[PDB]
Write an enzyme that holds these catalytic residues in place. Structure first.
Site, PDB file in Angstrom:
ATOM      1  N   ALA A  38      52.478  51.155  49.238  1.00 50.76           N
ATOM      2  CA  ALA A  38      51.613  51.687  48.182  1.00 50.76           C
ATOM      3  C   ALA A  38      51.860  51.028  46.835  1.00 50.76           C
ATOM      4  CB  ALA A  38      51.780  53.196  48.034  1.00 50.76           C
TER       5      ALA A  38
ATOM      6  N   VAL B  76      51.836  47.936  46.439  1.00 51.09           N
ATOM      7  CA  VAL B  76      51.135  46.651  46.520  1.00 51.09           C
ATOM      8  C   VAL B  76      49.660  46.846  46.183  1.00 51.09           C
ATOM      9  CG1 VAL B  76      50.318  44.846  48.063  1.00 51.09           C
ATOM     10  CG2 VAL B  76      52.709  45.645  48.201  1.00 51.09           C
TER      11      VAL B  76
ATOM     12  N   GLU C  49      46.116  46.121  46.676  1.00 51.51           N
ATOM     13  CA  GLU C  49      45.317  45.332  47.617  1.00 51.51           C
ATOM     14  C   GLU C  49      44.344  44.392  46.914  1.00 51.51           C
ATOM     15  OE1 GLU C  49      47.251  48.356  49.280  1.00 51.51           O
ATOM     16  OE2 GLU C  49      45.327  48.906  48.349  1.00 51.51           O
TER      17      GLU C  49
ATOM     18  N   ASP D  81      48.586   9.469  25.879  1.00 57.59           N
ATOM     19  CA  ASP D  81      48.359   8.056  25.985  1.00 57.59           C
ATOM     20  C   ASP D  81      47.644   7.586  24.796  1.00 57.59           C
ATOM     21  OD1 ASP D  81      48.487   5.664  27.291  1.00 57.59           O
ATOM     22  OD2 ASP D  81      46.373   5.787  27.913  1.00 57.59           O
TER      23      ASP D  81
ATOM     24  N   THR E 214      45.926   3.878  24.152  1.00 55.42           N
ATOM     25  CA  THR E 214      44.836   3.020  24.606  1.00 55.42           C
ATOM     26  C   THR E 214      43.884   3.633  25.636  1.00 55.42           C
ATOM     27  OG1 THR E 214      46.427   1.189  24.351  1.00 55.42           O
ATOM     28  CG2 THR E 214      44.278   0.735  25.500  1.00 55.42           C
TER      29      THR E 214
ATOM     30  N   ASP F 174      44.551   7.863  31.027  1.00 56.05           N
ATOM     31  CA  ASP F 174      43.471   7.103  31.642  1.00 56.05           C
ATOM     32  C   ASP F 174      44.033   6.127  32.669  1.00 56.05           C
ATOM     33  OD1 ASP F 174      44.681   5.335  29.727  1.00 56.05           O
ATOM     34  OD2 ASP F 174      42.790   4.451  29.086  1.00 56.05           O
TER      35      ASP F 174
ATOM     36  N   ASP G 191      49.711   5.973  33.414  1.00 54.18           N
ATOM     37  CA  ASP G 191      49.890   7.397  33.177  1.00 54.18           C
ATOM     38  C   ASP G 191      50.036   8.212  34.458  1.00 54.18           C
ATOM     39  OD1 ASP G 191      49.634   6.950  30.469  1.00 54.18           O
ATOM     40  OD2 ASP G 191      47.438   7.252  30.516  1.00 54.18           O
TER      41      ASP G 191
ATOM     42  N   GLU H  28      48.210  57.082  43.047  1.00 50.29           N
ATOM     43  CA  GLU H  28      48.013  56.947  44.486  1.00 50.29           C
ATOM     44  C   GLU H  28      49.294  57.227  45.246  1.00 50.29           C
ATOM     45  OE1 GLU H  28      46.735  53.105  43.881  1.00 50.29           O
ATOM     46  OE2 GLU H  28      44.591  53.390  44.256  1.00 50.29           O
TER      47      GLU H  28
ATOM     48  N   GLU I 185      40.835  50.715  45.170  1.00 49.35           N
ATOM     49  CA  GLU I 185      41.360  49.399  44.887  1.00 49.35           C
ATOM     50  C   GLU I 185      40.502  48.220  45.211  1.00 49.35           C
ATOM     51  OE1 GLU I 185      45.101  48.625  44.763  1.00 49.35           O
ATOM     52  OE2 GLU I 185      45.508  50.569  43.899  1.00 49.35           O
TER      53      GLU I 185
HETATM   54  C1  8WX Z   1      50.270  56.370  49.028  1.00 50.64           C
HETATM   55  C2  8WX Z   1      49.861  56.817  50.398  1.00 50.64           C
HETATM   56  N1  8WX Z   1      50.343  56.354  51.564  1.00 50.64           N
HETATM   57  C3  8WX Z   1      49.719  57.001  52.571  1.00 50.64           C
HETATM   58  C4  8WX Z   1      49.879  56.877  53.948  1.00 50.64           C
HETATM   59  O1  8WX Z   1      50.789  55.977  54.447  1.00 50.64           O
HETATM   60  C5  8WX Z   1      50.475  55.153  55.584  1.00 50.64           C
HETATM   61  C6  8WX Z   1      51.522  54.064  55.762  1.00 50.64           C
HETATM   62  C7  8WX Z   1      52.613  54.270  56.581  1.00 50.64           C
HETATM   63  C8  8WX Z   1      53.563  53.275  56.711  1.00 50.64           C
HETATM   64  C9  8WX Z   1      53.440  52.063  56.053  1.00 50.64           C
HETATM   65  C10 8WX Z   1      52.347  51.860  55.242  1.00 50.64           C
HETATM   66  C11 8WX Z   1      51.398  52.854  55.103  1.00 50.64           C
HETATM   67  C12 8WX Z   1      49.117  57.667  54.798  1.00 50.64           C
HETATM   68  C13 8WX Z   1      48.207  58.559  54.235  1.00 50.64           C
HETATM   69  C14 8WX Z   1      48.090  58.648  52.844  1.00 50.64           C
HETATM   70  N2  8WX Z   1      48.841  57.874  52.034  1.00 50.64           N
HETATM   71  C15 8WX Z   1      48.916  57.770  50.692  1.00 50.64           C
HETATM   72  C16 8WX Z   1      48.135  58.508  49.630  1.00 50.64           C
HETATM   73  C17 8WX Z   1      48.792  59.829  49.240  1.00 50.64           C
HETATM   74  N3  8WX Z   1      48.090  60.937  49.887  1.00 50.64           N
HETATM   75 RB    RB Z   2      47.880  50.268  46.533  1.00 48.37          RB
END
Ligand code: 8WX
Ligand code: RB
Ligand code: PCW
Ligand code: CE1
Ligand code: CE1
Ligand code: NAG
Ligand code: NAG
Ligand code: NAG
Ligand code: RB
Ligand code: RB
Lengths: 261, 987
Positions: B293, B295, B297, B339, B341, B680, B684, B749, B774
């Site tokens: 989460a 990361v 996307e 450069d 010239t 040129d 270079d 999130e 996202e």
């Molecule tokens: C931040 C978040 N992560 C999840 C999730 O994880 C799934 C997962 C499991 C393992 C590895 C990667 C992802 C499942 C459902 C809802 N999620 C939410 C949102 C809140 N509500």
């Molecule tokens: Rb995310």
């Protein structure tokens, strides 16, 4: 290790102030939140346009209700009977003391709250009304015989009303196998499969702290031995839906039944 | 290798070695074999570009490495769940499919973009085969340059491209244009005798890439293809490996921030997860879900389309960038090694100065004639104009009436071409004009006569006499004049006028210019009557007692837009160094003409020459300027170079080999500078590759340079560099606005999951819906912030400090994640409980309800009003918590895109509707936001349902608290620019 020792505490405390302020705002919002809503009725109840019917004994194998057992072998139905018994342990006269003897036989509407500490009056549903499926005379609830008693129950929805015409009655049948065998035949208790309409409506767990859903008991007299059958119990009533494809328990129950000898 | 003795060999040894003839050449058979043996006389291009490894390289990079790891972790977590029978693992699948998808799609983008760059650059190349005039079996004929083999006798004349490395066997006035190998602007004499031991500085070798300006030569191909000097230089520049770009370094550093925070949040909440009675298995699946989460996307999508929009801006000003990263580099640049010239200059001998009427005039040398011309009113002028227009045999190639006069091809010497363009620009239609004055005698430029002369009849019939016109070296002209035109008359040429002439002559030579004198004489019609039979050999017309007309003098001049560009770059704090292979006098002169070296700044040699002191005694700190030449640059210890580099801040490196330009670029990079080079020639190409960004001249530039470069000036307009800087400082400032806007929503999130772990309340937010946030709804808002103008005067700021000043750092991360993200979270949960309670679930019931909530076996769970709900019904209610947390997020992002518009200014100051595209984006945001909810059927497609319009309103107070809280933040920033408050709450 990075920032200064003297101000690490200063904005440490700043974050503290930030969270306590915000937290506070949340607190006040949820106080107002709860002050807003009525204690006896749900504001909107949007997923409850129709009630779901549940069933006992509930045994799920996979994919839903799967009740299998062998009549000659007490150990395959003892726990079924036991979940019936301890389910009806709150339908006993001793337990169900705080409710009235409903003989209204039509929708029982209470506008004024008359009962200790401002609660309202519930009907009676004592075990013996299921009769042959009450646990007496038979404490195996028709299992040992091969005609088991399933206890069908409708979910409660505050102020919901199911109809006027007759009482809402349940109907269990096969999923049609018409060429290769007769159709299902059931005896229900109380008779015709009816939850008397004085049992609706529900006014809420605060208005009726000692309330109890009406039951019916389907006693399956027809079902063949050592053969899987699927059985559906629909609630016949005008204000109820029994074919919502995104919820197979709305108005109906299915289960797979196998009775081995 | 071979050449270091090839020029030194005798002709006998040469034809012995190469099995050839210095007069007749290779047999036809032998040369054909040699060609098989050695491959074409052409430079090998990079051997492999499998179109699929272009793509495979598009899929790497800091973010993309992160997305890939996060996809794996998704799938390993899907295994760990499915093995122990956990349902709704499909969220793991979606997440990874999305992640992979995003990087792939960006990938295709980044690949096709590069395609569309490399075609446009290739649209500009000249693909007609260069040619050579070869002699084989004693037969002179024309072949393609690439069919030349080692040992061929070839021939060159003016206009020819030298087709190989040729050892010069004979030459009549051969002068050649080495500006591409050396930096040398001035024509270079070729001649058969060994001038040096280094073939680079010997005179008896002509170089495979270069141009023969004038004269004629014949000689033996001593090297071909990549064995030429040119091929070795382009090898050297192939083996050069270019560093990582600044924008990539920034992205990697903030992927390191995100990694750090995801790792430790996972750690602490996994430890926590055990101490509440979770299976090791599922505290590890939470660990995984958490680092995933963190990361974003979508950020790769938004960053690349941001960059790509700047690439569109620069393309539309004829600036073409090969890869998107390069779009930014000029913004972070702090040194420009340039450069001279053909980069700073035009590499085009141009008439610059004139001496007539006892005055030194100066011509407009710019290529678009945007300068200021000299005084064309006087009789003396039109006489000089006549001598220089008539005494010249050069001529324009035809069909050129539309192409600007400085850009016209011509057939003629270096001087004569210059003068023809000068006459055409000043008098107009020179060739016509001089046709109207029939030429009846001519002495071409002659090493024994030392001048060029021609006699003509005049224009109207009433005048029957002849005019002798002459041009030559200034002293030689003066020693044949007895007279001089001045200010309307023709004066005896007394000692006054000769001292005046010699001062003008050396004054103009001192600028390093090529000056020639011009003279004339009107011959009598008594002694030279119409039809007179002029004999050269017996000189039966006069060649002394001529009437001196003037001096015209020439130089390789700077490109029109260059000096203002250099000054704009310096007032943006960009150190500008000159790296050139030319000679130091020219190097410095142009350095001053353009602004490398300022007015009143002196080199230590100038201080010594002014105070008349030994250079040893001069204080080196007193010299703003320095000119170090390439054969003392060797003797300099790397620390002598760092000292010199930071003692005189106006640096001029002269006579510097291609390697030495690589040395200088590298020495500046070691001191942490982001250095850019502009160029040129092939000399270079190495430097251009090492530089953090290489900028090649579209037209002037050699192929090796255009190849080394990250960026091409398609119209050879140097001032695009100063727009490059400006745009480069924009996206940087704007990227951290977009980055921040997309990072914050990450915390509202993650937290609902964190809570859902620890408190076990039903799922607030599903993965499908945070994919929609996202990767869909918030994207336009995020890239619209790329259309933000500056807030300060970007172009007077110093270069960003790469160490302290960074894309995202601890302030921006902290403030954006843990403060605005927090406020967004609270807005989510507030809307959660509200929806629940309104539909029936009280908050305290919500604590620890998750196990029963998800339990497919409870189809009669009781709510706060004791109503029994099926599983599906509780599920729809959960989707409602998704949609409610989602629209909460959105509303606080409408707060967030506007708040991120500015980082110090107020929105009431500059605007809510400044950025028309961002307003568009928000309209789009609530439009698709409403489509996700109220479209028929949405519950069963993605998990959104039509939330009651109450629940839209519930977050808007938190949104506006974000607006107001950040507005007071960026109100105290500008109000009290003090210590305490800006370090913490400015990003
Ligand atoms: C931040 C978040 N992560 C999840 C999730 O994880 C799934 C997962 C499991 C393992 C590895 C990667 C992802 C499942 C459902 C809802 N999620 C939410 C949102 C809140 N509500
Ligand atoms: Rb995310
Ligand atoms: C790192 C820092 C983290 C900090 C997190 C701090 C969050 C704490 C904030 C608030 C907690 C609740 C405060 C309770 C006190 C306020 C007043 C109150 O008591 O209100 C009343 C309700 C129950 O009323 P009733 O039924 O008695 O009325 C009768 C019903 N009638 C009226 C119809 C008859 O009280 C209840 O429900 C009690 C149960 C409340 C439910 C628990 C809430 C769980 C959710 C937590 C998420 C918090 C957001 C996290 C985001 C962090 C972002 C960084
Ligand atoms: C602010 C904290 C949360 C409490 C706010 C709850 C407000 C409830 C919204 C009122 C909506 C209208 O009231 C119901 C009757 O109108 C029917 C609307 O449909
Ligand atoms: C949290 C603290 C900040 C205060 C936030 C208060 C927000 C709630 C305001 C309540 C004030 C009372 O006014 C109610 C306003 O509600 C108006 C929306 O009702 C119209 C909606 O139309 C019906 C929705 O259609 C959904 C279709 O579903 C079937
Ligand atoms: C049934 O109704 C009668 C009415 O006389 C009442 O006396 C009795 O108490 C009711 N049933 C029970 C078990 O109380
Ligand atoms: C129920 O029990 C009674 C005796 O109490 C019996 O007469 C009746 O037939 C039973 N019904 C069924 C369906 O077994
Ligand atoms: C039922 O149980 C009895 C006793 O355990 C056993 O002998 C019989 O074969 C079983 N029948 C089936 C069909 O399993
Ligand atoms: Rb001028
Ligand atoms: Rb480069």
């Amino acid at each position: 290790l990075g920032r200064t020792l003297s101000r690490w505490v200063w904005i440490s405390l700043y974050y503290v102030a930030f969270y306590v302020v915000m937290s506070g705002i949340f607190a006040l919002c949820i106080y107002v939140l709860m002050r807003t809503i009525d204690p006896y009725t749900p504001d909107y109840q949007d997923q409850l346009k129709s009630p779901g019917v549940t069933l006992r004994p509930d045994v799920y194998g996979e994919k839903g209700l799967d009740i299998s057992y062998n009549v000659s072998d007490s150990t395959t139905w003892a726990g079924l009977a036991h979940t019936l018994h301890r389910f009806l342990a709150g339908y006993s006269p001793a337990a169900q003391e705080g409710s009235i003897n409903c003989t209204s036989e039509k929708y029982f509407f209470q506008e004024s709250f008359l009962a200790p500490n401002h609660t309202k009056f519930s009907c009676k549903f004592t075990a013996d009304m299921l009769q042959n499926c009450s646990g007496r005379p038979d404490p195996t609830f028709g299992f040992a015989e091969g005609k088991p008693c399933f206890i069908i129950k409708m979910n409660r929805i505050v102020k919901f009303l199911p109809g006027n015409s007759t009482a809402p009655r349940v109907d269990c049948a096969f999923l049609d196998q018409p060429r290769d065998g007769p159709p299902l035949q059931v005896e229900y208790f109380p008779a015709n499969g009816t939850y008397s309409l004085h049992y609706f409506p529900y006014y809420g767990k605060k208005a009726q702290p000692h309330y109890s859903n009406p039951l019916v008991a389907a006693k399956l007299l027809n079902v063949p031995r050592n053969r899987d059958v699927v059985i559906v119990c629909k609630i016949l009533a005008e204000h109820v839906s029994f074919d919502n494809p995104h919820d197979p328990y709305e108005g109906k129950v299915e289960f797979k039944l196998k009775i081995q000898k | 290798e071979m050449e270091i003795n090839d020029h030194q060999l005798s002709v006998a040894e040469l034809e012995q070695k190469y099995q050839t003839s210095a007069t007749k050449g290779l047999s036809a058979s032998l040369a054909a074999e040699l060609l098989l043996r050695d491959g074409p006389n052409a430079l090998r291009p990079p051997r492999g570009t499998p179109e699929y490894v272009k793509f495979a390289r598009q899929l790497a990079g800091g973010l993309q490495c992160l997305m890939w790891v996060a996809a794996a972790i998704c799938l390993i977590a899907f295994a760990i769940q499915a093995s122990e029978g956990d349902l709704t693992t499909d969220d793991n699948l979606y997440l990874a499919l999305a992640l992979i998808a995003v990087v792939v799609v960006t990938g295709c983008f980044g690949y096709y973009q590069e395609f569309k760059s490399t075609n446009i650059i290739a649209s500009f190349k000249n693909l007609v085969p260069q040619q050579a005039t070869v002699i084989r079996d004693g037969d002179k004929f024309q072949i393609n340059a690439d069919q030349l083999v080692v040992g061929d006798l070839v021939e060159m004349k003016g206009g020819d491209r030298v087709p190989a490395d040729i050892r010069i066997l004979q030459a009549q006035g051969c002068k050649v244009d080495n500006s591409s190998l050396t930096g040398e602007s001035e024509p270079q004499t070729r001649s058969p005798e060994c001038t040096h031991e280094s073939p680079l500085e010997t005179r008896n070798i002509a170089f495979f890439s270069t141009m023969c300006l004038e004269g004629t030569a014949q000689g033996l191909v001593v090297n071909t293809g990549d064995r030429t000097i040119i091929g070795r230089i382009a090898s050297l520049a192939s083996g050069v490996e270019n560093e990582k770009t600044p924008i990539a370094i920034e992205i990697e550093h903030f992927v390191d921030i995100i990694a750090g925070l995801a790792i430790l949040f996972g750690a602490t909440f996994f430890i926590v997860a055990m101490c509440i009675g979770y299976t090791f298995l599922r505290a590890m699946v939470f660990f995984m879900a958490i680092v995933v989460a963190y990361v974003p996307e979508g950020l790769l999508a938004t960053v690349t389309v941001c960059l790509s929009l700047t690439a569109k801006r620069l393309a539309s000003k004829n600036c073409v960038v090969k890869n998107l990263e390069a779009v930014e580099t000029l913004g972070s640049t702090s040194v420009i090694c340039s450069d001279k010239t053909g980069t700073l200059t035009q590499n085009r001998m141009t008439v610059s100065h004139l001496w007539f009427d006892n005055h030194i005039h100066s011509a407009d040398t710019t290529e678009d004639q945007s300068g200021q011309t000299f005084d064309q009113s006087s009789e003396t002028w039109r006489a000089l104009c006549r001598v220089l227009t008539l005494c010249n045999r050069a001529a324009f190639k035809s069909g050129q009436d539309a192409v600007p006069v400085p850009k016209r091809i011509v057939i003629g010497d270096a001087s004569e071409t210059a003068l023809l363009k000068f006459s055409e620009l000043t008098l107009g239609n020179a060739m016509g004009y001089r046709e109207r004055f029939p030429k009846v005698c001519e002495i071409p430029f002659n090493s024994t006569n030392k001048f060029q002369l021609s006699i003509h009849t005049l224009e109207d019939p009433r005048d029957p006499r002849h005019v002798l016109v002459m041009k030559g070296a200034p002293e030689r002209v003066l020693e044949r004049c007895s007279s001089i035109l001045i200010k309307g008359q023709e004066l005896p040429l007394d000692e006054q006028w000769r001292e005046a002439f010699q001062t003008a002559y050396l004054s103009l030579g001192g600028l390093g210019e090529r000056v020639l004198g011009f003279c004339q004489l009107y011959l009598s019609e008594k002694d030279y009557p119409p039809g007179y039979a002029f004999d050269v050999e017996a000189m039966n017309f006069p060649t002394s007692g001529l009437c001196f007309a003037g001096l015209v003098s020439m130089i390789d001049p700077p490109r029109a837009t260059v000096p203002d560009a250099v000054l704009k770059c310096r007032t943006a704090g960009i150190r500008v160094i000159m790296v050139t292979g030319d000679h130091p006098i020219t190097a410095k002169a142009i350095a001053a003409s353009v602004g490398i070296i300022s007015e009143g700044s002196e080199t230590v040699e100038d201080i010594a020459a002014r105070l008349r002191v030994p250079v040893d005694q001069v204080n080196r700190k007193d010299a703003r300027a320095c000119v170090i030449n390439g054969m003392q640059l060797k003797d300099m210890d790397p620390s002598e170079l760092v000292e010199a580099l930071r003692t005189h801040p106006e640096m001029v490196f002269a006579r510097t080999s291609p390697q030495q330009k690589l040395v200088i670029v590298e020495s500046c990079q070691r001191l942490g500078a982001i250095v850019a080079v502009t160029g040129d020639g092939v000399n270079d190409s190495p430097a251009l590759k090492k530089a953090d960004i290489g900028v090649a001249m579209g037209i002037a530039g050699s192929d090796a340079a255009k190849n080394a470069a990250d960026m091409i000036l398609l119209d050879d307009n140097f001032a695009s560099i100063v727009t490059g800087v400006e745009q480069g400082r924009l996206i940087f400032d704007n990227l951290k606005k977009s980055i921040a806007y997309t990072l914050t929503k990450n915390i509202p999130e993650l937290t609902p999951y964190l809570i859902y772990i620890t408190v076990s309340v039903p799922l607030p937010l599903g993965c499908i819906t945070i994919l929609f946030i996202e990767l869909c709804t918030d994207i336009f808002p995020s890239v619209s912030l790329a259309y933000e103008k500056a807030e300060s005067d970007i172009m007077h700021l110093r270069p960003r400090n790469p160490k302290r000043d960074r894309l995202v750092n601890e302030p921006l991360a902290a403030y954006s994640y843990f403060q605005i993200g927090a406020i967004q979270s609270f807005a989510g949960f507030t809307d959660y409980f509200t929806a629940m309670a309104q539909e029936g679930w009280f908050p305290l019931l919500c604590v620890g309800l998750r196990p029963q909530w998800e339990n497919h076996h409870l189809q009669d769970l009781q709510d706060s009003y004791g109503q029994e709900w099926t599983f599906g019904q509780r599920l729809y209610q959960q989707y409602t918590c998704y949609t409610v947390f989602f629209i909460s997020i959105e509303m606080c992002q409408i707060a967030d895109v506007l708040i991120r518009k500015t980082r110090r200014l107020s929105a009431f100051q500059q605007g809510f509707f400044r950025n028309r595209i961002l307003v568009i984006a928000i309209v789009f945001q609530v439009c698709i936001g409403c489509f996700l909810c109220y479209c028929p059927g949405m519950p069963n497609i993605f998990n959104f349902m039509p939330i009651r319009f109450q629940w839209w309103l519930v977050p808007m107070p938190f949104s506006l608290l974000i607006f107001v809280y950040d507005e007071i933040r960026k109100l105290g920033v500008r109000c009290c620019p003090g210590s305490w408050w800006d370090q913490e709450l400015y990003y």
